[PDB]
């Protein structure tokens, strides 16, 4: 069955960028997909995204510009320490200048830089660069 919904969303985004289009049809929604795309939007990695209601569970349109070479999901949501942030920041990012790890923390969902300077941690979702 459809196990994760964020995984199929981000896989659809990555496939539609690797074929070079400018728009997707993400289906279905969640809190997690909406807040994940808001985290991409606050860094300006995607443009407009748009949420369509249908009373079942909504389909999302994301108008992606060109700026995302790869986002992804880490599907076993591992528990990460404060000191374990450097390991995921070294393993999945390109280098130490850019590149983000997205966590669910009890203060909310935030990137790895915001989880460093929040001084909290949580469970890992994925990564946007």
């Amino acid at each position: 069955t459809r196990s994760s919904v964020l995984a199929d969303a981000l896989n659809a985004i990555n496939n539609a960028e690797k074929t070079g289009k400018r728009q997707v049809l993400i289906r279905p929604s969640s809190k997690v997909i909406i807040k994940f795309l808001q985290v991409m939007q606050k860094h300006g990695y995607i443009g407009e995204f748009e949420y369509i209601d249908d009373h079942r569970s909504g389909k999302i349109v994301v108008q992606l510009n060109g700026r995302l070479n790869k986002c992804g999901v880490i599907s076993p949501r591992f528990n990460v320490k404060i000191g374990d942030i450097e390991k995921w920041t070294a393993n999945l990012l390109p280098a130490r200048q850019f590149g983000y790890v997205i966590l669910t923390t009890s203060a909310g969902i935030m990137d790895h830089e915001e989880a460093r300077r929040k001084h909290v941690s949580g469970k890992i979702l994925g990564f946007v660069y």
């Binding site: 289009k21 400018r22 728009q23 369509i52 249908d54």
Partner: protein, 81 residues
């Protein structure tokens, strides 16, 4: 096909596709208000009525279930909704 509106499709091509593959899922059915001339009364019948719906006074089969759409009786008028 690098760019096209998935938010506002053209409505000629929008109801052209499948029932479940639209942007919001809509039925492609309707309701039929049928007038057999023998008793002159309004009966609201589904367009895909899958049973032998008779009239409430005369024993006239208004529609028979034939697969997709229910075929109406001959010499009998109908209206939308």
């Amino acid at each position: 096909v690098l760019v096209q509106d998935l938010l506002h499709p053209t409505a000629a091509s929008e109801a052209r596709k499948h029932k479940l593959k639209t942007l919001v899922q809509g039925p492609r059915s309707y309701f039929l208000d049928v007038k057999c001339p023998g008793c002159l009364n309004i009966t609201t019948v589904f367009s895909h009525a899958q049973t032998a719906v008779t009239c409430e006074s005369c024993s006239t089969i208004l529609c028979t279930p034939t697969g997709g759409k229910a075929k109406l009786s001959e010499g009998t008028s109908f209206r939308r909704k």
